[PDB]
Design a protein around this ligand. Structure first.
Ligand SMILES: Nc1ncnc2c1ncn2[C@@H]1O[C@H](COP(=O)(O)OP(=O)(O)NP(=O)(O)O)[C@@H](O)[C@H]1O
Ligand SMILES: Nc1ncnc2c1ncn2[C@@H]1O[C@H](COP(=O)(O)OP(=O)(O)NP(=O)(O)O)[C@@H](O)[C@H]1O
Ligand SMILES: CC(=O)N[C@@H]1[C@@H](O)[C@H](O)[C@@H](CO)O[C@@H]1O
Ligand SMILES: CC(=O)N[C@@H]1[C@@H](O)[C@H](O)[C@@H](CO)O[C@@H]1O
Ligand SMILES: [K+]
Ligand SMILES: [K+]
Ligand SMILES: [Zn+2]
Ligand SMILES: [Zn+2]
Ligand SMILES: [Zn+2]
Ligand SMILES: [Zn+2]
Lengths: 306, 304
């Protein structure tokens, strides 16, 4: 026999990452399919197929854990996921439990990330861990004494949907600051500023060209004027926003994930720029890059069923 | 009314860009690559052209960089890492669906073209653009002009077999021999790419980790990952030393996912000399200056 198999999905805007882990917790499968962006029936299909295939291949019924960028309504189970249009408003858990004849756990992407990063032997005994995702959106996962705080309505750590603080607006020219609309339908949420997408939007706003983050960073590495100006502004903006968040949460460790966590300058600049914006007696948290690379989401989702 | 569209089609991701008459990027989209249904593949491309046509109210020129070769006679595609597109007349099919001319070019050639026209490289006698992603791809530029070859196969370094010194590193008759999408086997495409980096890890350690994950473990100093990275760095130096003995490029520009692994830029210059000829001098080895946009830019400016 094969034993218990744990399946994890990390659902994003573009790609669904799948992982299967055996009883030893060793990853034995890794697939990536296109996230069906129009039909929800197609969305369901994509997920169902991967579960079945893997069930066949390993000859088991694996447990199913899913990490999604948004919130499963704590009462109705309906999903609020701006970046996955196909799934917006659907009862994803119910629908899948039907189609796959077993329990399904759904969890926020950033919570899964934080859970997996925090269960590492190096962080497992930390009093608190903040998992921060900087990708298409800005997402937070709050772990206190090794346990996820998911909150009264599964919204804990939705730092991306808090509005720009005053000191950040002042950096961006106050009444002349760009006010970006948000997928949540509010306006000026940090989701659209500190994410990789936001990094891009901020560049475009000041310079009228739609470059990608890697492209801007490359220009910055070459010392190009616009990119140097952008990076300076963005590093200060990131320090201001995170200083606000750390004044509220005061986490012991902060772990960065998502695409923009690849920008190495972040790890050198944050420790330098944070002190000015924190309280005089604050001490910096340990700020580190994800220890599980891009797999924390999948791992965290799969181990919900541990 | 002049708008230039460029596509960079990869194993995982389709990148799209629109550039105005001033060559300023004014659009940027990124879809997953539909790699099973060719009808879906065609759809993805067609959608992005149309959307952009609507939004800007123009019909843009269309340039596409694909990871593989359009048969110089039949136009049928050989795309080793996209089962979907394999065998189809992509250019013909799209010219139909989009009622205008389409230029197709190899992804690595587009990348190299864009990287070579940078003011910093403009007068270099030769430039090798190297993509390390789902596959291994090369673009050869001599005196600022692309060499695409007798049948569009120039720079297909990914479909050359492991050299003897690389096989020796990996245990000779015990070395993993990976099958290739081209249907040969032992092609470097499956060893030096990000995918190959992963497959090599899995082969020695029996766990399906992603490259970023392996690198993270390496950064933490984990035993297996440190062993893997040492092996992989040596393997990369051996294979590239072989290729540079043939090509002797002035500049090598790295692109694709695995070009983000910073250790490469520190390790290659240290490890290459032992495997090159005694009087070899290292080329200038640099990370892509246009980040992940080289391919899109190159493709769009074919129609320039
Ligand atoms: N290596 C990189 N360096 C800098 N920015 C990057 C890098 N990779 C991706 N990005 C940017 O990160 C953004 C996409 O982040 P990504 O984390 O891939 O999003 P996602 O997959 O949609 N969601 P999720 O995985 O849950 O965070 C885009 O703005 C990219 O340009
Ligand atoms: N930041 C990174 N560090 C290391 N490996 C990476 C990184 N980003 C992506 N990869 C790896 O790169 C491979 C995918 O190549 P990538 O270039 O991202 O996509 P692609 O469109 O399939 N290929 P390409 O032909 O280069 O455009 C996978 O093995 C990824 O794990
Ligand atoms: C309401 C909503 O869509 N929020 C999501 C959040 O759940 C996620 O963690 C973050 C990063 O992916 O992106 C968005 O902010
Ligand atoms: C025959 C074939 O499909 N070769 C492709 C090559 O064209 C491409 O440049 C490289 C990098 O994407 O991947 C593959 O090796
Ligand atoms: K959360
Ligand atoms: K080529
Ligand atoms: Zn919001
Ligand atoms: Zn890991
Ligand atoms: Zn081959
Ligand atoms: Zn550029």
């Amino acid at each position: 026999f094969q034993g218990t198999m744990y399946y994890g999905f990390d659902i994003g805007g573009t790609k669904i990452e799948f992982g299967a882990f055996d009883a030893d917790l060793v990853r034995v499968a890794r697939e990536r399919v296109a996230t069906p962006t129009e039909s929800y029936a197609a969305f369901l299909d994509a997920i169902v197929t991967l579960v079945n295939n893997a069930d066949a291949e390993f000859g088991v019924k694996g447990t199913v854990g899913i990490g999604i960028p948004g919130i499963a309504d704590v009462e109705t189970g309906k999903l609020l996921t701006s970046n996955i249009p196909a799934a917006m408003g659907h009862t994803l858990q119910r629908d899948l439990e039907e189609r796959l004849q077993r329990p399904v756990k759904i969890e926020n992407d950033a919570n899964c990330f934080a859970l997996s990063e925090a269960w590492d032997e190096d962080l497992r005994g930390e009093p608190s861990v903040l998992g921060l995702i900087l990708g298409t959106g800005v997402g937070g996962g709050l772990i206190f004494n090794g346990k996820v705080h998911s909150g009264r309505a599964n919204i804990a750590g939705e730092i991306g949907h808090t509005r720009l603080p005053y000191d950040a607006l002042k950096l961006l020219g106050m009444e002349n600051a760009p006010i970006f609309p948000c997928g949540c339908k509010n306006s000026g949420c940090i989701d659209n500023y500190l994410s990789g997408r936001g990094f891009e939007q901020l560049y475009d706003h000041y310079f009228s060209e739609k470059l990608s983050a890697p492209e801007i960073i490359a220009h910055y590495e070459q010392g190009e004027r616009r990119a140097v100006q952008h990076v300076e502004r963005f590093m200060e903006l990131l320090a201001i926003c995170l200083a606000n968040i750390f004044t509220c949460l005061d986490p012991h460790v902060v772990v960065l994930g998502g695409g923009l966590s690849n920008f190495e300058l972040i790890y050198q600049e944050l420790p330098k720029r944070l002190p000015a914006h924190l309280l005089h007696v604050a001490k910096l948290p340990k700020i580190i890059k994800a220890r599980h690379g891009d797999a924390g989401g999948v791992r965290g989702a799969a181990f919900l069923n541990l």
